[PDB]
């Protein structure tokens, strides 16, 4: 971000810096393919990267604003965040896991899967298909 | 007949399994292995064996008990020892077909135990049973019991099969599928001619299957219509079923495309609101229009824009609009056309009118159209040939209410008139 552009149009907030990474950096040669995008922005990729950065809170906020419909997950994100990040509810974690296996596991947008898998610790057999790009 | 009186006592139940163990469930025998006369005996004998064992297991009561049910009775479940004996015999049965229904039922029982314990094996037994074609087997057993083997013995007996299906629905132990529904419908069908005595069980089936079927209809035409048809004849509770047809809270169909409003909660593909829409576009004033403000839901989200409509309507009046459109093609229909639906639709009309016969007069939305369908329908084909039968049936039921008309119709009914020379 600290190098030309726009200089990004908006304020230097962390969120925008990541939007820049996702948009300017190599998610697009000349933009496209299989993300879920609203208003020109891959939300799931954003949440994933923000999470990658360590900005969990911001990632949570993005989800809140998201316009999505897996919303139960939204709940499970927030408490994961609230606690020590080992979100352990004696309650639902089990429920989240079932949904992952049935709905999410066989399908979806790579980043969405990443967020579910990583936050949830959903499927211990380990590896994320499309978006592991670095060692 | 005796088991029907009370739940089985544990001693009785254990003895039951003991004999089945020694007998081998009476599986092997000589059927036409030898003479033909003996052959007709086999299915019926097997059915009794399956019915009785399932009756003894009393899967429905047992599962409830496991969850926790108040008691009166003593149950076999209480003694671990009895369970051990029963387990061995049934497990061995797993490698044989007749006691497939027992295998399925017990797998559920073991599985209810599963949360308490573990159940590696039961999963396999359930799988084997389904693969076993227990569903198909049940249908045949059901036919045997169906008005033939014995009126009184059978429907009390069929009830046993029904209980198994009730529990089986929960998981995916077995989701709402074609096989389960089909088998259930057949057990209910228990191919018979109208005559009332006993009925069947209630609500758990109701929400899971009967109501579920309604939700899909008319999108899924066959199940809802078939179930309605079977029940109406058999049950004296004509009013509830009939009232349902006259007053139908829900309508399920394919979705015409695009602008209608949506209301939000969750990411909601599901909820939306409507403005006015006409099921039938221009082709006669008579049209089905659904006022705006009606709520709708998008069920599948898969391959299609399938929406549920809260719109309450009369099933009979609706069907008696849909078929007519088929003739002209002048009108256009949101619903969608097909011959197969034709066979059950007319039959339901037929059955409803016949059953209601007395309060026949109110019942007919389809007097003239059906005859027109019949003349045009005349084909040299099996699917329509089946439909032709339905038309005839409707005519027969119609005859009591309006006799003159049927006869006037027959004067120029295409099938019969030899007279022309």
Curated annotation (Swiss-Prot), chain A:
Sequence intervals crossing the membrane: none
Location of this chain's protein in the cell: Nucleus membrane; Nucleus, Nuclear pore complex; Nucleus envelope
Effect of residue 113 to W: In NPHS12; doesnt affect nuclear envelope localization; impairs nuclear pore complex assembly; doesn't abrogate interaction with NUP205; doesn't affect SMAD4 interaction; doesn't affect IPO7 interaction; impairs SMAD4 protein import into nucleus; impairs SMAD4 protein signal transduction
Involvement in disorder: Nephrotic syndrome 12: A form of nephrotic syndrome, a renal disease clinically characterized by severe proteinuria, resulting in complications such as hypoalbuminemia, hyperlipidemia and edema. Kidney biopsies show non-specific histologic changes such as focal segmental glomerulosclerosis and diffuse mesangial proliferation. Some affected individuals have an inherited steroid-resistant form and progress to end-stage renal failure. NPHS12 inheritance is autosomal recessive.
Annotated family: Belongs to the nucleoporin interacting component (NIC) family.
Role: Plays a role in the nuclear pore complex (NPC) assembly and/or maintenance. May anchor nucleoporins, but not NUP153 and TPR, to the NPC. During renal development, regulates podocyte migration and proliferation through SMAD4 signaling.
Subunit-level organization: Part of the nuclear pore complex (NPC). Component of the p62 complex, a complex composed of NUP62 and NUP54. Forms a complex with NUP35, NUP155, NUP205 and lamin B; the interaction with NUP35 is direct. Does not interact with TPR. Interacts with SMAD4 and IPO7; translocates SMAD4 to the nucleus through the NPC upon BMP7 stimulation resulting in activation of SMAD4 signaling. (Microbial infection) Interacts with SARS-CoV translation inhibitor nsp1; this interaction may disrupt nuclear pore function.
Protein name: Nuclear pore complex protein Nup93
Organism field: Homo sapiens (Human)
Full-sequence portion shown in this chain: 274 to 410 of 819
UniProtKB/Swiss-Prot annotation, chain B:
One GO biological process term: nucleocytoplasmic transport
Cysteines joined through disulfide linkages: none
One annotated GO molecular function: structural constituent of nuclear pore
Keyword Phosphoprotein: yes
Signal peptide: none
Principal subcellular localization: nucleus
Oligomer status and interactors: Part of the nuclear pore complex (NPC).
Family: Belongs to the Nup188 family.
Listed name of the protein: Nucleoporin NUP188
Source species: Homo sapiens (Human)
Included range, full protein: 220 to 644 of 1749
